[PDB]
């Protein structure tokens, strides 16, 4: 009966599919921080240069 | 060379529902299978 309990319920492996979501999302916020003025006039180095 | 047209202005217009109308493309960027 273990196979039925694991297969029927989809949220059984919620602990393992919880560090994948946390690790990936924290990565995205990094990349999206490359498009901020931070007080300058543009976010592109070659444009201002 | 103008001509007067309007005469005896009367009852104001009517009103209608709009539902979900009046959406336009905000920019010129191609996106696929995404929510923006």
């Amino acid at each position: 009966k273990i196979q039925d309990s694991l297969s029927s319920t989809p949220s059984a492996l919620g602990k393992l599919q919880d560090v994948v979501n946390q690790n990936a999302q924290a990565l995205n916020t990094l990349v999206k921080q490359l498009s901020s003025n931070f007080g300058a006039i543009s976010s592109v180095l070659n444009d201002i240069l | 060379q103008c001509v007067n047209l309007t005469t005896r202005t009367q009852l104001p217009p009517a009103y209608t529902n709009s539902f979900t109308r009046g959406v336009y493309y905000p920019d010129k960027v191609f996106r696929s299978s995404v929510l923006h």
């Binding site: 995205n28 999206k32 | 960027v29 191609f30 995404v34």
Partner: protein, 49 residues
């Protein structure tokens, strides 16, 4: 190589594509808001980066 497509600067390798643009869109973007494809102003063909 280095490319300057009508105002878009960058470095990389270009190749053909299978994507289809609506006939007013110029370039495309990825999930993290990074440019992925462009359109040649003179030949109106889609290229990857």
């Amino acid at each position: 190589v280095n490319f300057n497509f009508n105002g878009l600067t960058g470095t990389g390798v270009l190749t053909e594509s299978n994507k289809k643009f609506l006939p007013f869109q110029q370039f495309g973007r990825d999930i993290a808001d990074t440019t992925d494809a462009v359109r040649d102003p003179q030949t109106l063909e889609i290229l990857d980066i």
